[PDB]
Enzyme design. Structure first.
Site, PDB file in Angstrom:
ATOM      1  N   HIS A  30     -17.962  21.894  18.001  1.00 25.68           N
ATOM      2  CA  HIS A  30     -18.896  23.000  17.807  1.00 25.68           C
ATOM      3  C   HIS A  30     -19.962  22.600  16.786  1.00 25.68           C
ATOM      4  O   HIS A  30     -20.037  21.439  16.367  1.00 25.68           O
ATOM      5  CB  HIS A  30     -18.149  24.310  17.470  1.00 25.68           C
ATOM      6  N   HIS A  68     -20.781  23.536  13.628  1.00 25.44           N
ATOM      7  CA  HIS A  68     -20.639  23.546  12.176  1.00 25.44           C
ATOM      8  C   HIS A  68     -20.595  22.118  11.616  1.00 25.44           C
ATOM      9  O   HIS A  68     -20.384  21.139  12.338  1.00 25.44           O
ATOM     10  CB  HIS A  68     -19.380  24.290  11.763  1.00 25.44           C
ATOM     11  N   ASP A  99     -18.460  20.465   9.776  1.00 28.94           N
ATOM     12  CA  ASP A  99     -17.259  19.659   9.901  1.00 28.94           C
ATOM     13  C   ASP A  99     -17.126  19.023  11.283  1.00 28.94           C
ATOM     14  O   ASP A  99     -16.172  18.267  11.502  1.00 28.94           O
ATOM     15  CB  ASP A  99     -16.007  20.484   9.525  1.00 28.94           C
ATOM     16  N   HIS A 107     -13.588  31.001  17.608  1.00 30.83           N
ATOM     17  CA  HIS A 107     -14.072  30.620  16.285  1.00 30.83           C
ATOM     18  C   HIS A 107     -15.594  30.593  16.247  1.00 30.83           C
ATOM     19  O   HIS A 107     -16.219  30.993  15.251  1.00 30.83           O
ATOM     20  CB  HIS A 107     -13.535  29.235  15.930  1.00 30.83           C
ATOM     21  N   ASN A 126     -13.245  31.136   8.113  1.00 32.08           N
ATOM     22  CA  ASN A 126     -14.657  31.268   8.444  1.00 32.08           C
ATOM     23  C   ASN A 126     -14.801  31.970   9.785  1.00 32.08           C
ATOM     24  O   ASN A 126     -14.565  31.359  10.830  1.00 32.08           O
ATOM     25  CB  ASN A 126     -15.291  29.883   8.502  1.00 32.08           C
TER      26      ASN A 126
END
Ligand SMILES: C[C@H](CS)C(=O)N[C@@H](C(=O)O)c1ccc(F)cc1
Ligand SMILES: [Zn+2]
Ligand SMILES: [Zn+2]
Ligand SMILES: [Zn+2]
Length: 230
Positions: A83, A85, A87, A148, A179
Site C-alpha cells: 500500500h 504508506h 513503511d 487498513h 493507524n
C-alpha cells in the site's frame, strides 16, 4: 526465533527464512512517539529475488539491500509495494536507484503521489476489483477490498503456503486499532473474510507489523476492528 521489535536497532534489518526460497525482512522505525517493527517479504525467482515492500525508509531499505547481499547474494530485480504508506514505499527511490523495477497498483501509485510519498514506477494491472488475483513471478498478488487502506494488497506464496497480509492483518499481541486514518473500518471485516475464503489453506500468515501466526490472525484482526468500531 522470529526477531522482535525489542531486538532490532532502528537502522538495521534482519532476515528470517520462512521456507526454501522465502524470507521475511524485519526492520524497526520511530513513528509518532514509539518504535514499531515492520515486515516485508523476499521470494526467490530462480537467480533473482522478488521484494515485497520496503524496509520503511531510505536508510533501512539500503540496510535491507546490504543484508540481502550478505545473507543471500541474489539480486533484487523487482519490488511490489502493498500500500501507499511509508513503511511500504519509503525506500522506493533507493530501490529504483539500485536498478530494481518497482511496482504498485494504480491506486497505490496515485495515493502515494497525493500524500507526497515515494512512487513506484510501474503499475500492476488486473487488481482493480475486490477478489482479483494475479500471478506475478513466484507469488500471487490479491486485492481483498478496502481495509487498513483502500489500496492494500495481500501476497500469497503457493510453493510454501505463505500468506503475507501486510497491514490489513494484525499480530496477536496488538489488541487495539493502530493507524486507521486511511482505513475503511466498515469494509475491513468483509475484506478479511474474502482473504479467508481465498486462502483457507494458508499455513504461515505474516502481518505487516510483528509476529507471524496462522489464519487466527484474521479473526483476531476483525475483533480489533470491531472493538474499535463498536
Ligand atoms: C507507519 C505505519 C504505516 S501502516 C503505521 O502506522 N503502522 C501502524 C499500523 O499498521 O496500524 C501500527 C500501529 C501500532 C503498532 F503496534 C504497529 C503498527
Ligand atoms: Zn532469472
Ligand atoms: Zn499503512
Ligand atoms: Zn504498516
Amino acid at each position: 526465533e522470529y526477531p522482535t521489535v525489542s531486538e532490532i536497532p532502528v537502522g538495521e534489518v534482519r532476515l528470517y527464512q520462512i521456507a526454501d526460497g522465502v524470507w521475511s525482512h524485519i526492520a524497526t522505525q520511530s513513528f509518532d512517539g514509539a518504535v514499531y517493527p515492520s515486515n516485508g517479504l523476499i521470494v526467490r525467482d530462480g537467480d533473482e529475488l522478488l521484494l515485497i515492500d520496503t524496509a520503511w525508509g531510505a536508510k533501512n531499505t539500503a540496510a535491507l539491500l546490504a543484508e540481502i547481499e550478505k545473507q543471500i547474494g541474489l539480486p533484487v530485480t523487482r519490488a511490489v509495494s502493498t500500500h501507499f504508506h511509508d513503511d511500504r514505499v519509503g525506500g522506493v527511490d533507493v530501490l529504483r536507484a539500485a536498478g530494481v523495477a518497482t511496482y504498485a497498483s494504480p491506486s497505490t501509485r496515485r495515493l502515494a503521489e497525493v500524500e507526497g510519498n515515494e512512487i513506484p514506477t510501474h503499475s500492476l494491472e488486473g487488481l482493480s476489483s475486490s477478489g482479483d488475483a494475479v500471478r506475478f513471478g513466484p507469488v500471487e498478488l490479491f486485492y481483498p477490498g478496502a481495509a487498513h487502506s483502500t489500496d492494500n494488497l495481500v501476497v500469497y506464496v503457493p510453493s510454501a503456503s505463505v500468506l503475507y497480509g501486510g497491514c490489513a492483518i494484525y499480530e496477536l499481541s496488538r489488541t487495539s486499532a493502530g493507524n486507521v486514518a486511511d482505513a475503511d473500518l466498515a469494509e475491513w471485516p468483509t475484506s478479511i473474510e474474502r482473504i479467508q475464503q481465498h486462502y483457507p489453506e494458508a499455513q504461515f500468515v505474516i502481518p505487516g507489523h510483528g509476529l507471524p501466526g496462522g489464519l487466527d490472525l484474521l479473526k483476531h484482526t476483525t475483533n480489533v476492528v470491531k472493538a474499535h468500531t463498536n
